[PDB]
Amino acid sequence: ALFTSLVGASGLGFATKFLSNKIRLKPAGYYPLGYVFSGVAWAGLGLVLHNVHQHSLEVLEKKK
Amino acid sequence: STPLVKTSVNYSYGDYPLIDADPHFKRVVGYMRPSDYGVIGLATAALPAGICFAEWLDPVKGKFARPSVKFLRVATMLGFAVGFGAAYARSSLRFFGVTENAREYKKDEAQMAARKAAGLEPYGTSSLTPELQEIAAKNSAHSIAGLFIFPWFNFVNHPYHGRE
Amino acid sequence: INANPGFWNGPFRYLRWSAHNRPHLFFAFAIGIAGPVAALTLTPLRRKYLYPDHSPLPQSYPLPQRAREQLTGFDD
Amino acid sequence: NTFIIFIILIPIVGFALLAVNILLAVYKPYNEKLGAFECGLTSFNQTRLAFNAAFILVAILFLPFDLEISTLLPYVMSIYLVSNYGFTIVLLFLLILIIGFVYEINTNALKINK
Amino acid sequence: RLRPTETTEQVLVNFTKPNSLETVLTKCDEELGGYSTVNLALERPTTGKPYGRFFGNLSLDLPKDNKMVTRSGFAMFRTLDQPSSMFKTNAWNWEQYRHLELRVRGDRRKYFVNVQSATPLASDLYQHRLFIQTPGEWETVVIPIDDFILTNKGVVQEQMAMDTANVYTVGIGLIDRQYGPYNLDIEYIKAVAHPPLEFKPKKEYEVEKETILLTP
Amino acid sequence: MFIGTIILVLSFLGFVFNRRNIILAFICLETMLLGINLILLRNSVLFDDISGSLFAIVIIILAGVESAIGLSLLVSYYRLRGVINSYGI
Amino acid sequence: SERADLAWEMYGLLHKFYVVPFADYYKAIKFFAQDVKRQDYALLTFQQIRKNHDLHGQPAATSEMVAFLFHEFAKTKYKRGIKRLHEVVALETSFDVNRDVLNEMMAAYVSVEDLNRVQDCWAQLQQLPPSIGANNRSVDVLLSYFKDNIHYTERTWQGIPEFGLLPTLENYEQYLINNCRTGNYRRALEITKNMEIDSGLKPTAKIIAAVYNYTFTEQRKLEVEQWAEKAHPEMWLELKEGDKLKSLCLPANSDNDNVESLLKQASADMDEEMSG
Amino acid sequence: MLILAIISLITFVSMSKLSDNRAIIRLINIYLILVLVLDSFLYLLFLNNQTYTVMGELLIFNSFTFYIDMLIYFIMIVISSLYGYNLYNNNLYKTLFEPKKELIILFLINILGALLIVHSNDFITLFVAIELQSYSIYLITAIYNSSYKASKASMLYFFMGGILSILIAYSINTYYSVLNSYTLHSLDSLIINTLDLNLILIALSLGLLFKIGIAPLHKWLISIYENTPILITIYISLIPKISILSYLVLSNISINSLVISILAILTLLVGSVGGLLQIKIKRLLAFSGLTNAGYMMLLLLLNNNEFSYLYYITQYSISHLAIFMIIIFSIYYINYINNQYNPIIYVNQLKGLIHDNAYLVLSMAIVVFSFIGIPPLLGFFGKLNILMSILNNGYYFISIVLIVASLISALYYLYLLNVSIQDKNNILINSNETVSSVLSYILSSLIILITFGFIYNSLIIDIFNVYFN
Numbered sequence A: 001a002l003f004t005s006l007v008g009a010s011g012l013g014f015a016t017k018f019l020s021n022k023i024r025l026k027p028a029g030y031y032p033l034g035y036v037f038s039g040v041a042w043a044g045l046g047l048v049l050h051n052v053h054q055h056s057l058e059v060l061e062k063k064k
Numbered sequence B: 001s002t003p004l005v006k007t008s009v010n011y012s013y014g015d016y017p018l019i020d021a022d023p024h025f026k027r028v029v030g031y032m033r034p035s036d037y038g039v040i041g042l043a044t045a046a047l048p049a050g051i052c053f054a055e056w057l058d059p060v061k062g063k064f065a066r067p068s069v070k071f072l073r074v075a076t077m078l079g080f081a082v083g084f085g086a087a088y089a090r091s092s093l094r095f096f097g098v099t100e101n102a103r104e105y106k107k108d109e110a111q112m113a114a115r116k117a118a119g120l121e122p123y124g125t126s127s128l129t130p131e132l133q134e135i136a137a138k139n140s141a142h143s144i145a146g147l148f149i150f151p152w153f154n155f156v157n158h159p160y161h162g163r164e
Numbered sequence C: 001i002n003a004n005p006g007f008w009n010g011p012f013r014y015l016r017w018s019a020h021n022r023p024h025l026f027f028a029f030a031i032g033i034a035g036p037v038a039a040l041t042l043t044p045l046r047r048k049y050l051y052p053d054h055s056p057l058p059q060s061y062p063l064p065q066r067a068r069e070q071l072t073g074f075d076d
Numbered sequence D: 001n002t003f004i005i006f007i008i009l010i011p012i013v014g015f016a017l018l019a020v021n022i023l024l025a026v027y028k029p030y031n032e033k034l035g036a037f038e039c040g041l042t043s044f045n046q047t048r049l050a051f052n053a054a055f056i057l058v059a060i061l062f063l064p065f066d067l068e069i070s071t072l073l074p075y076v077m078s079i080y081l082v083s084n085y086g087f088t089i090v091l092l093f094l095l096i097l098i099i100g101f102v103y104e105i106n107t108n109a110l111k112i113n114k
Numbered sequence E: 001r002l003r004p005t006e007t008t009e010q011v012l013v014n015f016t017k018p019n020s021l022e023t024v025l026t027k028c029d030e031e032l033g034g035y036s037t038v039n040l041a042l043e044r045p046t047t048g049k050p051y052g053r054f055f056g057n058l059s060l061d062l063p064k065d066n067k068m069v070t071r072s073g074f075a076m077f078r079t080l081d082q083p084s085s086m087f088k089t090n091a092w093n094w095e096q097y098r099h100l101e102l103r104v105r106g107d108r109r110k111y112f113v114n115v116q117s118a119t120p121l122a123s124d125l126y127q128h129r130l131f132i133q134t135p136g137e138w139e140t141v142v143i144p145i146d147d148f149i150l151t152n153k154g155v156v157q158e159q160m161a162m163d164t165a166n167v168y169t170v171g172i173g174l175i176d177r178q179y180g181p182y183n184l185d186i187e188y189i190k191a192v193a194h195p196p197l198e199f200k201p202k203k204e205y206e207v208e209k210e211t212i213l214l215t216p
Numbered sequence F: 001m002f003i004g005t006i007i008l009v010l011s012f013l014g015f016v017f018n019r020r021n022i023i024l025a026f027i028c029l030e031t032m033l034l035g036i037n038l039i040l041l042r043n044s045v046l047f048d049d050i051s052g053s054l055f056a057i058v059i060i061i062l063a064g065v066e067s068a069i070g071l072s073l074l075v076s077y078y079r080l081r082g083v084i085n086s087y088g089i
Numbered sequence G: 001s002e003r004a005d006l007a008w009e010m011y012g013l014l015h016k017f018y019v020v021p022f023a024d025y026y027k028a029i030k031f032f033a034q035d036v037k038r039q040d041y042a043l044l045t046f047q048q049i050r051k052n053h054d055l056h057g058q059p060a061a062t063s064e065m066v067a068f069l070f071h072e073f074a075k076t077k078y079k080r081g082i083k084r085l086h087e088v089v090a091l092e093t094s095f096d097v098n099r100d101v102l103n104e105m106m107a108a109y110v111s112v113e114d115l116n117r118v119q120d121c122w123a124q125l126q127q128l129p130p131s132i133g134a135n136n137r138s139v140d141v142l143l144s145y146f147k148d149n150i151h152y153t154e155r156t157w158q159g160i161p162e163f164g165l166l167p168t169l170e171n172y173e174q175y176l177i178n179n180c181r182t183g184n185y186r187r188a189l190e191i192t193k194n195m196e197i198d199s200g201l202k203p204t205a206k207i208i209a210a211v212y213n214y215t216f217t218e219q220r221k222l223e224v225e226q227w228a229e230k231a232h233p234e235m236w237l238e239l240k241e242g243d244k245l246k247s248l249c250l251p252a253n254s255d256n257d258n259v260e261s262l263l264k265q266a267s268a269d270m271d272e273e274m275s276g
Numbered sequence H: 001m002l003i004l005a006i007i008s009l010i011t012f013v014s015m016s017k018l019s020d021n022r023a024i025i026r027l028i029n030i031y032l033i034l035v036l037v038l039d040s041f042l043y044l045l046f047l048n049n050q051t052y053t054v055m056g057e058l059l060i061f062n063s064f065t066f067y068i069d070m071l072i073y074f075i076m077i078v079i080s081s082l083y084g085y086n087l088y089n090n091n092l093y094k095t096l097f098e099p100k101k102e103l104i105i106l107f108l109i110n111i112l113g114a115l116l117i118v119h120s121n122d123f124i125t126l127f128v129a130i131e132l133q134s135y136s137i138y139l140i141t142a143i144y145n146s147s148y149k150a151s152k153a154s155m156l157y158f159f160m161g162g163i164l165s166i167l168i169a170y171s172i173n174t175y176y177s178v179l180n181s182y183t184l185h186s187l188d189s190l191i192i193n194t195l196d197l198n199l200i201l202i203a204l205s206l207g208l209l210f211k212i213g214i215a216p217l218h219k220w221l222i223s224i225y226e227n228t229p230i231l232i233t234i235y236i237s238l239i240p241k242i243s244i245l246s247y248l249v250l251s252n253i254s255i256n257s258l259v260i261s262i263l264a265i266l267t268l269l270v271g272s273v274g275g276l277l278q279i280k281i282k283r284l285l286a287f288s289g290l291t292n293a294g295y296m297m298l299l300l301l302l303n304n305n306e307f308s309y310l311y312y313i314t315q316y317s318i319s320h321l322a323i324f325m326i327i328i329f330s331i332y333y334i335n336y337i338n339n340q341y342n343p344i345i346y347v348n349q350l351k352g353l354i355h356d357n358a359y360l361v362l363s364m365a366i367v368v369f370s371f372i373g374i375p376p377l378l379g380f381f382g383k384l385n386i387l388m389s390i391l392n393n394g395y396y397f398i399s400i401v402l403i404v405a406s407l408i409s410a411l412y413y414l415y416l417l418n419v420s421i422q423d424k425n426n427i428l429i430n431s432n433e434t435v436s437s438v439l440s441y442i443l444s445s446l447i448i449l450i451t452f453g454f455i456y457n458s459l460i461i462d463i464f465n466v467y468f469n
């Protein structure tokens, strides 16, 4: 589902932000606005990839 | 204007009808949607905005200092460049019949209808010998596939556009 | 005494500054950029007004695009 | 045919070079008076001399610029045959080269002692 | 495991051994027409560790037997040139040391630590002056490896880093422009890895204190 | 082709053996390129085809650029600039 | 400063034409460095003494200049001069390295942040007898290089008794700064309160104002000015009108970041304010 | 988009101060980011494995070239971010990672050469692109010439690459002499069956593969990687390999080659065993790259290997960037610096890193496990695709060699983790300086990609099936 893909991408962005905070030796809740930015960006990338996947399936089905 | 070699007729590069296999630069710019100009402006504002955002994220010398006007102007010029390249590629894939090109197809139809009514040649007449026309078409054929690498546009009125 | 006013601050002021303070570079750019620009902006004008371009010269024999006709004369 | 000549010639001159190079194994062990150079003394009192980077850059850059110029010779021999397409290609070629010429001028890399 | 051995030291000029002197050679200006003399002794007394002795005279008088020379008066010793015949290493590896420590009693003379390493040129030398702080008493003067200054023919040059992976010889020499006898008693020369930060003078030298540490 | 191939063989084996004679190794590079160009030109003449000669001139230009870069490398390596910067900032 | 270039040409004619006393070299080196703005001529003036001694036979330079000229280089963070002067020292056949050169050479490397050279100069000072060797100037540089490392600042403090030294007023001040800039506001007060008992060195204005300046808690800043009113009443009152006290602290909703990261930014800003 | 960048950089860098280098590199970083995010729609040209020929049959364009092209831009963005953005805002890190005035221009010219290698359709274009990449990479290696350790590596790399390029040109000219052609379009099944041009292609593959350094010509590039600056080594050890291997995969000239198979087995054995004998980080990573190159060379023996090669090269590029960036970040937690160019040398200097940055050690553990092939990380899946491909074609001995090589390499991979999870009582001389947020974010993104890229395995498989068939 599109919603599930967006949720997964946003969670991956949150995980990336958390890992960046922990690498810098900083608390987990350091820059929550950065959490929002990372989640939005990774969710957008996930949306683009999901759209590519949907177009791929459409192209696969159309030649039948 | 007589072609010297055989070319594919109405070849389908995608799910849409072919308009022009090797559209001219003036042709591509003339068939440009307003959305492509929006993309051009988007990039032209995005590189300076990207520079400012990168400066905010990690200042070069520790203290936040906005980049000088020289960097903003270079970024603006390069943004216009990348936006123009993206717009040209989008218009080209519209010509190639890859994306939606219904309005472009209708405008193309009306255009050569008017040109035939005026008693002209279908894709122009050139200053170049027919051998040079063939060489130009063979060099510029599908050159938009290398937009990531180099810029190259069709500035030759050659008849090798893959149409009837 | 003399300091560069900057090209972007003023185009014509910088043009005069380059013409008066850096003659060699200014003239190098002038003749260099005149060529392509004058070509682009004058070749259509020359074609329209002065004289049309000459007909292409032959590169080999012009082969007729037709079948072999039956000819009579100079037979064995 | 070139591969064949290469492969069979390798062993013969290879062995010849091998033998002539096992010869120097011991020779002129350069027992010369290398004592003042393993300490750090100088005996010239003169012959300092200098070479600005711009001098060696003139010498080296004579070569790529000469190649750039000599690449124009094929164009002038077929100027009429490739008139407009070739004219544009040569213009782009010259502009690309002038980008590097502008680099070497702005950097002031070629200005000898001032 | 079976990896190349890693160590925090490597003795270069050991001395203190019956052979010792076979590891090093000497070169005075007698190679030129000069009159300086060099000779390396071996002292093994009691109540102490046996050391080497590096003495001689450094007469700076020019060689009035030839003319193309301009300045003379040197005397040096160095490790034997590294034997690279067909299969062995080729040279020394100093990529994990960053220092060289040598224990010596000094005098008023100004000695140089001379290092020969891989270099495109032939007579390039990495040399750093041996700063003798305490004359007449032993001192473990440490010289950082990446502070030697490249010299060819005795002239400071473009300071490119030493090739620590390929080092040939290490030695001490006199290029001091002064007359008179000289002496220098060395008992080891080694390259020592990075020491951790310490905040005591030394264990070999100490000053009166409360001695908080428990006695053994 | 005989002359080009044999020049290439001799220069290649001169490179392999010395390998520490940077002047002579770079000379051997130049001579190997010359030997390859000779073979290419001979085959282009035999086949009466222009691609061989075009690749030959391309190899000439590339060889020139490579020689310039390599001689800059040798300048940096041997410190040809000199120093005499003593008693200076 | 504007005419600093002009002083260079006039210096050249003074030496080409007239023989210049050697003692005048000290004044020119101090002038062409510690006086107005320019330090390039300080090195060249030192290089002038070297060139004449080697070639002409003029009397050689002494180690006093290199010790002084390192100190002047450690003020403008002049990375080029330190490298240039070091290799001149490393191949000198007239003067040698001693306690004073290493101290200022170590301070020159702290300014340019060279973790290797700083430890290198500390090894050479350490391996020397305490008679001539590690002094209060050595500790002064060593503490200033551990300004943001509380662990190595402390072990440096216990180093002073081992070398046979008694801390000085300039020695105490940096120790108070280092404790303050790492969040140890409370421990700093006990050091200042009990320093006069332990050593007999009465706290000065440059000590007390330092503790107030580098305390970045609005309440901890108050406890600093609790003993001062009733133990040093007269000598505080001359700091209120001198604008020495500065009230820089940490932000309010700043618990998002590390407290230790705040102390770095607060102290870095405070270092500039005390630089002039 | 790249030619214009090169021209604009020459013009702008010509008229800029040295202090503008970071800003220029940042500008190109965002420029390339926008090139990827804005011109990415060009993948619509390659539905159903549609192929185009460009510039008079001198260039080829398909989905494979497009994907390698995008991967090269992503790698270039990461590496240029490593140069534009300052890891730590202090003078020491200023000195260690300071870009040269021409470094970004050389980087872009080398990217151009690599792309022209990937897109080549003719031997003249192939040779010209090879020479462009080679000269650019020589200049990249030599641009830091203040040390003899770097100088010897630069000179060795110049001479060895000159010999290799001469051999490549000789093979190409022999092919031309045989066929009077400079393109592969003249090669068909009948052409291969009737005439014996196999040796020419074997020599060409030999010359090309030696440029990336397979056995028994591995030692010179390993020395070069050891001696070049690490911010240079991270680039010179990935991009040329990607270009050469992509050209070899797309060329498809080594089907079931005995010589190629034997050399791949030798490369795997040498990389696995020689890694056990390494105490330096750079040499260990060089042998790791050798082992990965052997793994990818095993894919040259069979057809329909596009998916496995693409997946493995992408995951290896990500892991390579991640491991070098981890090594770069760990520089802050050591008490001394070896060289201005290579600040860390021996694996022993990473000892006890878990007591300075535990999450850095966690990221390194993830990347090392992906190198070993522990599921569900990307490295395991790439190795699994390689195993499936080689077992589909019946290379059983090759599979056994692959498994044994992986098992051996796991030992010296776990060497790193075992050293790093030790105890270092020596406390740091540095504290509390904050690491760059941009570079930390990029490293974390690489680690998260390695950790959770297996989510999109089916999606990637479907996209490959629709865009490559």
Ligand SMILES: CCCCC/C=C/C/C=C\CCCCCCCC(=O)O[C@H](COC(=O)CCCCCCCCCCCCCCC)COP(=O)([O-])OCC[N+](C)(C)C
Pocket: A009, A012, A042, A043, A045, A046, A048, A049, A052, H036, H037, H038, H040, H041, H043, H063, H066, H067, H070, H071, H074, H306, H307, H310, H311, H312, H314, H315, H378, H449, H452, H453, H454, H456, H459, H460, H463, H464, H467
């Ligand atoms: C807003 C525009 C930004 C786009 C910039 C993209 C740069 C790509 C760069 C570096 C590679 C990073 C991973 C790319 C993923 C493969 C896409 C694909 O699907 O791979 C296929 C081919 O699969 C293959 O053979 C094997 C691919 C091996 C991938 C190995 C990594 C696995 C983990 C990555 C999972 C992604 C996580 C995203 C989280 C939100 C190419 O697809 P395609 O040629 O049909 O075009 C795609 C449409 N595109 C251009 C819009 C994207």
